[PDB]
């Protein structure tokens, strides 16, 4: 139904940044300040073609590669009636929701660097509580988050 918040930890030029959102978001600012690093945090979360390559050394804060990259997004879900996109989320998730917290949802991303194979694996999660986030089920190259969201990236 509605986006609420995004918390970005240990990414490129964000140490620990919490941004309240809505639908229809507009970001602005100076040059070399990180407007396009905000939009790649949504591409690594909700798009699979960016997520399939993993993380390099340069995706970490001040090239550290000993901190964990974590990107968490919050959905509102307070309107089950009259909205179809709430049913589009609820029909795929099926088991991570709780009746005590039926009007909040969380989609998270964790990444810890290997430093032997030189690779950052990306593990996605959902849930309705910030503790006990189970992993997203999936078979092959497709998980169940790809059945819900479609990301159209436009850049001239």
């Amino acid at each position: 139904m509605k986006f609420s918040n995004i918390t970005i930890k240990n990414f490129r030029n964000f140490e620990k940044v919490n941004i309240n959102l809505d639908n229809k978001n507009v970001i602005f600012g100076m040059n070399d300040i990180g407007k396009t690093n905000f939009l790649y945090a949504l591409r690594f979360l909700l798009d699979k073609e960016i997520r399939k390559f993993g993380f390099n050394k340069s995706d970490y804060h001040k090239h550290d590669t000993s901190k964990k990259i974590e990107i968490i997004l919050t959905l509102d879900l307070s309107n089950y009636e009259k909205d179809e996109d709430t049913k589009k989320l609820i029909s795929v998730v099926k088991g991570a929701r709780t009746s005590a917290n039926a009007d909040v949802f969380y989609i998270a991303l964790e990444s810890k660097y290997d430093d032997k194979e030189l690779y950052g694996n990306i593990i996605l999660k959902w849930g309705s509580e910030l503790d006990n986030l189970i992993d997203i089920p999936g078979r092959g190259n497709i998980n169940a988050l790809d059945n819900v969201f479609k990301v159209i990236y436009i850049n001239p």
Binding site: Y80, E84, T86, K87, K88, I90, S91, V92, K94, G95, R97, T98, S99, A102, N147
Partner: protein, 200 residues
């Protein structure tokens, strides 16, 4: 175009609740495959079906006639429908966090015919038995209590499926009829029922 294609035009173009009282044979399977293919062709949205049979090889033949799709449709038995879509994800949500998640379906050893005693067996002994009387079901009454207690299970059933295809309705108890009337009346789900009356 006579009575066969007239009944085909009455059974394809009507999208309401359909009650079929057919005879022995005469192609219930091919009219089920054609009704399922017409409903999957007509629906543009994300919604899904639940083909419910009583024998898994007929559902395997229905899935072989249909094919492979990514809409998440369920084809299977009634016991697999209740065991996968109802009991196992929401048994911790309905009966509290102290009840266990996973279980093994074995209704051949326990013959207790009490409700709170059956809840104490599924709490303590971690098995899912059945009632001693063959006219009552512990499992479908457990599914009715899960859809009565939990809010998330009603939202998942109303969001996921839009038409439940029931085959062989005549060898069903009153608990299955009460659960399907609870799915039809309160959750506004269109229901599809075929079967032949009497004929042993």
């Amino acid at each position: 175009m006579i009575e066969d294609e007239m009944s085909r035009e009455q059974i394809i173009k009507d999208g309401g609740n359909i009650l079929v009282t057919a005879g022995a044979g005469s192609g219930k399977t091919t009219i089920l495959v054609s009704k399922i293919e017409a409903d999957l062709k007509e629906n543009k949205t994300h919604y899904s079906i639940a083909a419910v049979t009583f024998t898994n090889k007929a559902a395997k033949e229905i899935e072989g006639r249909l094919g492979y799709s990514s809409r998440g449709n369920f084809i299977g038995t009634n016991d697999g429908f209740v065991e996968s879509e109802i009991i196992r994800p929401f048994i911790k949500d309905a009966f509290g966090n102290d009840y266990p998640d996973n279980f093994t379906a074995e209704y051949f050893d326990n013959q207790f015919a009490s409700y709170d005693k059956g809840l104490q067996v599924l709490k303590y002994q971690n098995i899912l038995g059945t009632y001693s009387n063959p006219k009552k079901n512990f499992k479908f009454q457990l599914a009715l209590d899960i859809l009565k207690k939990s809010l998330v299970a009603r939202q998942y059933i109303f969001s996921k499926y839009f038409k439940i295809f029931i085959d062989e309705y005549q060898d069903s108890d009153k608990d299955m009829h009460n659960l399907f009337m609870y799915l039809k009346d309160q959750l506004k789900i269109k229901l599809f029922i075929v079967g032949d009356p009497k004929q042993s």
